[PDB]
Amino acid sequence: KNLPEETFSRFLLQLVGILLEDIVTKQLKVEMSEQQHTFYCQELGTLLMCLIHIFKSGMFRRITAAATRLFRSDGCGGSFYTLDSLNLRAR
């Protein structure tokens, strides 16, 4: 028995995990071009803007209450991008 809010928040956060683990460790020439890297940055920008509008506009309350309980808890046995891995990628 899984909640819909859990599925939405896990999907968005694993997508940020994908984008971050791509943007950090992938070389600027031998894999992607310059326009591809700028589009990576633009995609992650509009994704975090959609996440901010979800976390701020107040029409989405259950999604925030879902995110508060899974940001804080650990990854399920390493089967998820846990939060401090995203902090390593951000730092």
Query: What value, to the nearest 5°, has the Cα angle with vertex 87 and ends 82 and 90?
Result: 130
Residue 30 has a CB neighbour count (10 Å cut-off) of 6
Q: Which residue has the tokens 């020439």?
A: 29
What is d(CA 60, CA 90) in angstroms, rounded to the nearest whole number?
26
Q: What is the resolution of this structure in A?
A: 4.1
Q: Which amino acid is at 7?
A: T
Nearest by Cα to 21 from 1, 3, 40, 38: 40
Residues 6 or more apart whose CB falls under 8 angstroms from that of 7 comprise none
Method for structure elucidation: cryo-EM
**What's the Rg (C-alpha) of the chain?**
15
Are the C-beta atoms of residues 67 and 16 closer than 8 Å to each other? no
Residue 79 corresponds to which tokens in the numbers above?
Answer: 């089967």
